[PDB]
Structures are given as structure tokens and as C-alpha cells.
């Protein structure tokens, strides 16, 4: 699915999607 | 739960090649940052280098740049140490760990949780 | 690099005792300071987070504070879990650094 490459790319300079 | 497990303890000569790795799992791998830290016999924690598994980019330090090399394979979640030619002074336990982050306009900044349980190494002749 | 200096080395305590340890930095990191505890033969594990942040499972008997190169964990009332080895770690700026660890024994 290319959903999860482009999140992939998201989450490498933004806030991981755990941290509160 | 999020884990990461490693690789059995090792023994090698010096000189010989070593692969060493870290699974993680209960956590989508290729959306943090991946660590590994080495502690030698009684003494402190020493970062080694990071990698990101979503493309492989990878930072090391620069007290371990040149002889140890990092690497991940998404496809099974599992991110690695590497070294061509152990030395007795590479005698340590190895750690990864993943690293979440806190970033603001593309600054980003990092601390570890969680840690593997730890690859035992011993290099001697 | 960052060099992170740990006081003092090694605390003596008994349980219920409150305990400080300070993590000086030798370059201004903000806020972006972390405190781990590790006991022999185990990995670390992760009890504070850029400078204050609980780590949720963590009690709140421990806590961090300070801001730029001076910082505090403090446990209020020590507990027989709390004997250990603690590390502070910043994640400011490369290359990311670790404190020297203060061991932490039992009084007698």
C-alpha cells in the first residue's frame, strides 16, 4: 500500500505517533 | 506490547566478521528511529549511531563511524550491527533501542525506549 | 560533544529515604534530558523524558527537573526496587551522550 510509504516519510521529522 | 529482542551472545576471535540484530515488534518499525548503544564490562552507556528503517538513513558517531556499520531489512523488522574485523576492544554488551521523538519545524529531538534485552560479545584470541 | 557529569557517583540510602542525583551538561540542552535505570546484568529502562515527563507506568515518587545544563531526579521515598544504577542521556544534539550513572546502594 503507498499509504504507508508516504506515512513512512512522514514520521521521520515529525513527533512519533505515540509521544503525548 | 511494544519489544525488541535480540541475537544470542556471541563468541569470536579477533578478526573474524559478526552480524547482530534486533526484531522488533507491536510497533510499526519503519516509523522510528532504531539506536544502538554499546556497554563495555563495568562501565557507561556509549551511543553508537541510529538509523530510520522507513528509507536506511542512517547518523553515526564518530567514535564509531569507519569500523561498525548499521543496517535494517523493513521487510522483517529488524535492524543490525555489523562489523568486518572484530577487535578484543569491540568485548561488550550491545544494546538497540527504538527512539521516539518530539520535532517542531523539522527539529527533532530523541531519548530511548524501549531497550533490547542485550547481545553479549566477547572478542579474544 | 556534550559532556554529561553525574553528582555524586554513588548514594547510600535506606528504603523510605528521599534521594537527589544531579546531571550537569556541559553545553545548554534546553529541556531535552532523560533519566534511565539499569540494574546489573539487565537493559535500562527509561523513567523520565525531556527533563520532566513521567514515563506512564513509571511511580511518581520519581521526578525530574531543570532547564539548560542543570538537572535533578529526585525520588521521594525510596522503595527495595529503587537500588540501581541511574543514567541521564541527552537528545539535543549530536552526538546524543550519556552521564557517567550514579549507583545507588543500601545504607547500614
Known amino acids: 500500500d503507498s499509504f504507508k510509504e508516504e506515512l513512512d516519510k512522514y514520521f521521520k521529522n515529525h513527533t512519533s505517533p505515540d509521544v503525548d | 506490547e511494544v519489544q525488541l529482542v535480540e541475537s544470542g551472545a556471541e563468541v569470536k576471535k579477533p578478526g573474524e566478521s559478526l552480524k547482530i540484530s534486533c526484531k522488533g515488534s507491536g510497533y510499526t518499525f519503519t516509523r522510528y528511529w532504531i539506536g544502538w548503544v554499546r556497554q563495555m564490562p563495568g562501565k557507561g552507556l556509549e551511543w553508537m549511531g541510529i538509523?530510520?528503517?522507513?528509507?536506511?538513513?542512517?547518523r553515526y558517531s564518530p567514535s564509531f563511524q569507519g569500523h561498525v556499520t548499521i543496517s535494517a531489512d523493513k521487510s522483517i523488522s529488524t535492524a543490525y550491527l555489523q562489523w568486518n574485523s572484530l577487535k578484543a576492544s569491540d568485548t561488550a554488551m550491545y544494546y538497540c533501542?527504538?527512539?521516539?521523538?518530539?520535532?517542531?519545524?523539522?527539529?527533532?529531538?530523541?531519548?530511548?525506549?524501549?531497550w533490547g534485552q542485550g547481545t553479549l560479545v566477547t572478542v579474544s584470541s | 560533544e556534550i559532556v554529561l557529569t553525574q553528582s555524586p557517583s554513588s548514594v547510600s540510602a535506606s528504603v523510605g529515604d528521599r534521594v537527589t542525583i544531579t546531571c550537569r551538561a556541559s553545553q545548554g540542552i534546553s529541556s531535552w534530558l532523560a533519566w534511565y535505570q539499569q540494574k546489573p546484568g539487565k537493559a535500562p529502562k527509561l523513567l523520565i523524558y525531556?527533563?520532566?515527563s513521567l514515563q506512564s507506568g513509571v511511580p511518581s515518587r520519581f521526578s525530574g527537573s531543570g532547564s539548560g545544563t542543570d538537572f535533578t531526579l529526585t525520588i521521594s521515598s525510596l522503595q527495595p526496587e529503587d537500588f540501581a544504577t541511574y543514567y541521564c542521556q541527552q537528545g539535543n544534539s549530536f552526538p546524543y551522550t550519556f552521564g557517567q550513572g550514579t549507583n545507588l546502594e543500601i545504607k547500614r
Open positions: 533501542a527504538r527512539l521516539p521523538q518530539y520535532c517542531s519545524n523539522g527539529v527533532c529531538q530523541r531519548w530511548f525506549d524501549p
Open positions: 538509523i530510520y528503517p522507513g528509507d536506511s538513513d542512517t
Open positions: 525531556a527533563a520532566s
